Amino acid sequence: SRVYEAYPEKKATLYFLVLGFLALIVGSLFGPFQALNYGNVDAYPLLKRLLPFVQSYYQGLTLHGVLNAIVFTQLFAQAIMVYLPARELNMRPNMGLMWLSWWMAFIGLVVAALPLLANEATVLYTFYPPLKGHWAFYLGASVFVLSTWVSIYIVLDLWRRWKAANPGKVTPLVTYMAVVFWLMWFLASLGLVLEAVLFLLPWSFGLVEGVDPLVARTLFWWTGHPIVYFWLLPAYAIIYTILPKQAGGKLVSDPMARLAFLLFLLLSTPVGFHHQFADPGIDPTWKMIHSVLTLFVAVPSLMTAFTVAASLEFAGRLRGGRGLFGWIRALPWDNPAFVAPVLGLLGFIPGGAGGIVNASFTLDYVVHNTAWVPGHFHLQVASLVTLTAMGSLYWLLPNLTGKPISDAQRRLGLAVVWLWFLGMMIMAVGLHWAGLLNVPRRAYIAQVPDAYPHAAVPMVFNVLAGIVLLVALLLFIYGLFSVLLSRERKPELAEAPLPFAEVISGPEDRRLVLAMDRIGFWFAVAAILVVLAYGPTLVQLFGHLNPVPGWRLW
């Protein structure tokens, strides 16, 4: 193809997309089985015939979390937030590095993968010491994540090469989003990196005998909160810059979009104690400090709510809908690339509301480590983020490949996203409810069937969801493979422009953009809040290391 000669990043992006979606399929096969479990039905005897390398409930759960929440989310962040800025600026990435990042990700995935399958790191996706997994997991994970460091450099190089060619011009909207998104992730990743190199890796190598588990969780949840803004922002990018045009309208405000992203840069990392509310030996004052800052990081989301809703109401009126609710009808509910992210935003309503409960310090004692939590994050990452990702298949697959999407294909995709959305809301009800009834997470409850008899109703919902979501998963594998196993190609598809939206602009726009565009100033601010937030506690805990021996209990 002469298409890939002109535009090589198309082929690199696609490599990212597929590995992610592969991961996602394998990841989500464990899903309905975990829902059945949460409904008191043990389906594991079954799954083990079918998949005989699975030895425990807790192995599956580990593969589920790692494969869905870490691999798919990162490979998607990688595809979207490199490709879109490349195409906004009509400029080419350094191709050498682009491939290198891919190879780093593939190699790490496969090294990590091997102990996971052989049952030598049944430690879950949080891998909390002193549960001691195979050294290969630690080394796997490490190279996988660090692949993003290359990604970061690629986009800053783009930016830089555009700014040198355009002195005195403001950063275009998409490349703006990606710039602060990559600089934020750089700050946010240093916890786990630091956890990996001074603790996990040396200890799994047997070069030191123990790890201090309080320092580990601390550095861990350094990265651990803002890894979820890293999942979310690519979806948000699409929803601000692409979803408008697909609905029929325009994004209502460039300034307000930018301010969203900039507040994430500032507030996404300095917040982790919200994961450590019930941890001993961390100061109550520092817990409150983190809780208040956790409420601020919700403000960009509250803000995104108004900007996007006003956008859809716009498009809708321009499409003939009148009155308080007629605008909603006028929107294009035939088009999967539209419906998906939108039903996603809908479930994010209850999911963001649970997010704020969990945030609120003392309130956390009600819900912490109960079913409430997985109920909360499925609405957030398993539906908004994933629904958006599947959605983009419907414009991104034919723009990287040249393969058309049929009418039929389109109709199946609509079914798929509907059922996924509905399955997720159904499971939310179940898990929210089981949790208020003290039902724990990370538990093979199906194996202690008389232990939670007061939760038999909420359990009915989780059996239902597990079925609805099995069918949705099956029609997705078949769907996606009918496109990716299609012979027919239209090279004029690969040659169109990405469906970016037009922006409504206003006199205030200029003076505002220029502020936000002082990027170095804003990054130094965010680094400052990190040192201040974590700094006095780490010096405490480092001053007082109590490392303990590792255990293998599976």
Partner: protein, 31 residues
């Protein structure tokens, strides 16, 4: 006036308050 977005943000605010206040209730009940 963006009556539509305002109705959505109304829905937003209400869910937030039912979640948050409903859980505050449980806290002091268990307390």
């Amino acid at each position: 006036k963006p009556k539509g977005a305002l109705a959505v943000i109304l829905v937003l605010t209400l869910t937030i308050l039912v979640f948050w206040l409903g859980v505050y209730a449980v806290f002091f009940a268990r307390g």
